[PDB]
Design a protein around this ligand. Sequence first.
Ligand SMILES: Nc1ncnc2c1ncn2[C@@H]1O[C@H](COP(=O)(O)OP(=O)(O)OP(=O)(O)O)[C@H]2OC3(O[C@H]21)C([N+](=O)[O-])=CC(=[N+]([O-])O)C=C3[N+](=O)[O-]
Ligand SMILES: FC(F)(F)Oc1ccc2c3c([nH]c2c1)[C@@H](NCc1ccc(Br)cc1)CCC3
Ligand SMILES: [K+]
Length: 984
Amino acid sequence: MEAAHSKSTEECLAYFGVSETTGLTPDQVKRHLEKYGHNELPAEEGKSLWELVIEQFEDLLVRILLLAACISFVLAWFEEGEETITAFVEPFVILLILIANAIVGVWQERNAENAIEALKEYEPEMGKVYRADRKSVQRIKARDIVPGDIVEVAVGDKVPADIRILSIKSTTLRVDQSILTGESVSVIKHTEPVPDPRAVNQDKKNMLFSGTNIAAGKALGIVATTGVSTEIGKIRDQMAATEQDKTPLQQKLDEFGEQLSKVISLICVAVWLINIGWIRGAIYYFKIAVALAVAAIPEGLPAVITTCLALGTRRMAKKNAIVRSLPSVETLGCTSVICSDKTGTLTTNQMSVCKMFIIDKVDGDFCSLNEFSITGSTYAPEGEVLKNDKPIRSGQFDGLVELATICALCNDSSLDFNETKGVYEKVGEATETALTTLVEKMNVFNTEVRNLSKVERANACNSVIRQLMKKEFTLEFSRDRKSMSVYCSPAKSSRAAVGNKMFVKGAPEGVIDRCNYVRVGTTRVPMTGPVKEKILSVIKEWGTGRDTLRCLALATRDTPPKREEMVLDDSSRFMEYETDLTFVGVVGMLDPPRKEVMGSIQLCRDAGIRVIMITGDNKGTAIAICRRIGIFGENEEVADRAYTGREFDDLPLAEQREACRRACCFARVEPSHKSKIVEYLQSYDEITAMTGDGVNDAPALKKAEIGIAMGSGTAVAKTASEMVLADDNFSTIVAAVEEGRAIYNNMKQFIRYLISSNVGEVVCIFLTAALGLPEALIPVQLLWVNLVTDGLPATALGFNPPDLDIMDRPPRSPKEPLISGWLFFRYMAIGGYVGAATVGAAAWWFMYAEDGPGVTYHQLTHFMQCTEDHPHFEGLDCEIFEAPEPMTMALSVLVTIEMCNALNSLSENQSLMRMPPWVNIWLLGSICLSMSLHFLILYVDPLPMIFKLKALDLTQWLMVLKISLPVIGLDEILKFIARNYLEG
Ligand SMILES: Nc1ncnc2c1ncn2[C@@H]1O[C@H](COP(=O)(O)OP(=O)(O)OP(=O)(O)O)[C@H]2OC3(O[C@H]21)C([N+](=O)[O-])=CC(=[N+]([O-])O)C=C3[N+](=O)[O-]
Ligand SMILES: FC(F)(F)Oc1ccc2c3c([nH]c2c1)[C@@H](NCc1ccc(Br)cc1)CCC3
Ligand SMILES: [K+]
């Protein structure tokens, strides 16, 4: 049933064929389950495992490795002679590593997915329905509440569906629906039809929305829509699925992927070309092509990448930064401008009326004032009211009595006592509750409150004013006039002839212009120029002083219009109905900046991040706040870097864009302006973190490259967001950007470490083919390196502790190459030394090791010419070239160097003498475990037969360290030219 908000109780009942006492029949339930599905957000769709395999097949390197599989398969098939046929392990392993990688990408594609699942969290487990089974209410699983059944809800329950209220059983019904509308005040719900069929949800005051909770009361309704049809379920309809564009790192990695394709193909052609001058031969340059493919591809890199991301996500997630979109962590390092709202994010949103003034005397041009101050900054109703630092019984001033009345009446919020926490808490809007607390502190009628209870005391004095003036109706706040008013009539009935009143509170600018009189206690004197000046002179002093107060003016229309001649259907006339007012006084409440923000702001400048503050204060106060928290200097001229929504809109398009180039402070912007500022910032290739919590903030969060939504905010903003501030703190953003920087510098390290490791293997294979030597590494050994003995240090590298200057450098540009020009030189030379060292390791055994045959280099590089007992190969067994020992020398050198390179990769440019190995203790363990797995693979008797290895003696090991360790002295020397001859 659509638009049930416009239909009467009887109509919705007549629509579904239900009784308000009998409920639904099980037969009706079956029929509805069929015609409406269950009451839940359906499981993820559009994702096919088989169709996902196509994406893996489409990737280039997967195509290569898949081709290396079929080759390795046919090679093991054909080569029955001179080897055991139980040697299909290599093609099998190739497939498994390919299968594993497919699983891996899918496995945490669900981590990039379920970002939108943060909305599935808002629906409840259970609900209550009256049904045709029992005369009492049955508690059903919420996902089985079909449309049409009668639902009961009480205090503190979650509304389990979208329900048209049928009959409120308690006195009144208040519904917290902030989660869906942003309404920070519990809405009064009624049972009448709201007439407009397309009215906004804020007007649907007869509807219960799923996912919202009941502030107070108890009602009975009938389910109008379930699951997706609900307004909270309408949020899932977009379901992302927008244009998906590769991240900059994803794009760069793929360019390396194809340069790797070119390089493999060329080497493959070169060795087929070098061999100048058959079945046994067709084997060779296919075997090495497999050895080539396996040696070039990092194999385990996606596993390491998606792991260090997951652990970084949880690191950030415990710093109150909830990463929805995973590509964000890359983007977070490139953040050039954070643009955030003031209230609740730069400040505590913990309101307290700090100062207030009424008029003292008026003589001609002169106008004195009675200024008051109030101790206590919590919502607790405790503290003095001060005049000249001394206590004052507020009720002695008739001007304060009227101020207290206006505050208590121009108010839709209240105070509550949390029985468990033992503290006073905010009900409804924070800025209104500040007035509630102020009234209780003033106590203008000297209501006896001492012997009350912590609960009763919360609203005693507010209730006393409610006992005097009966709030007939309210004139809602509009932004054109920046004020609201309430029409009240006397309720004592014993007291006579007071008359109907209208109490107006609003921004001092507009309210004061619509005043014609100033109340002096109980007397009335017309509004004059000299007095209005002194009023604004203190309002401006307060909103610009060291305490930076938002100010509110309180007024009264002494003679309101005829209640039967006011038309409440159109806001446009509301301002006129608040004319001929009498200025009563002004309250000034503080909302102090969070302890951290001043320092957190400083970091953004040190790191080259511009901070734009969007706020609703006046341009005067907005500028002042920016000096207080440090966006501007106290003595700096900020004329050109602070704008208002109307000022900004006055500039032509060209002058608009130049403003965002330099601006840092926006006051009172329309909703559309956030999205317009982002567009302008994009025109300068600036990468923006933009914050929002409200329902209108959605498009500027989809548009911003890093949409940041508030944890206490609406559901829609969270959905359009890339990240969520669980603690609402602005410093959580800075900490998020900082962490996002460290992670990329660590991804860069293990990317280089793994790929430079790959280079050494490609060199080793290439020399073997070029020199005609026997194979020194076989693909099974390489995969064990590129997946295990390298993967563990590669991961632990991602935990390299951040640089000390990490927040003293400009944002990384999105086009920043993975390697500089010189890094290409450094890693080629190391990958070269790694290639030569592994081949020489095996050659040393064949020619010089005591256990080895001690053959000559001509013999060794013609080892396949050992057809029979040759005169050339005198005293040798042909098989000695297939011996496990030379391979195990090479693999042991490849492993040991990659442990040393891991120690080198601890820093891109720092010596190990300055930043020692134990700086990353997680990395030491990764090396201890990789080496352990190497001794395991040599010593547990199923394993050596597989990988074709044999345990080295003490001599052969000391030869590995003889060979391997200099790679440290090589990189240390290479790191020297960097920090001493390249930058200067
Ligand atoms: N586009 C705008 N043009 C003009 N003023 C704007 C605009 N947007 C917001 N304001 C005013 O600024 C006040 C608080 O803004 P501020 O807390 O700085 O930031 P926001 O709460 O708007 O943003 P956030 O909640 O953090 O997303 C609001 O209080 C009030 O009017 C609102 C308000 N209200 O929002 O309901 C009621 C009120 N009385 O008296 O009822 C007085 C306000 N006031 O004096 O500012
Ligand atoms: F060895 C397998 F083929 F099985 O696994 C891999 C290992 C590494 C890569 C690489 C790619 N496909 C691979 C597939 C290519 N793009 C896939 C990819 C893109 C971004 C991220 Br993050 C991870 C992988 C480009 C080089 C890196
Ligand atoms: K976005």
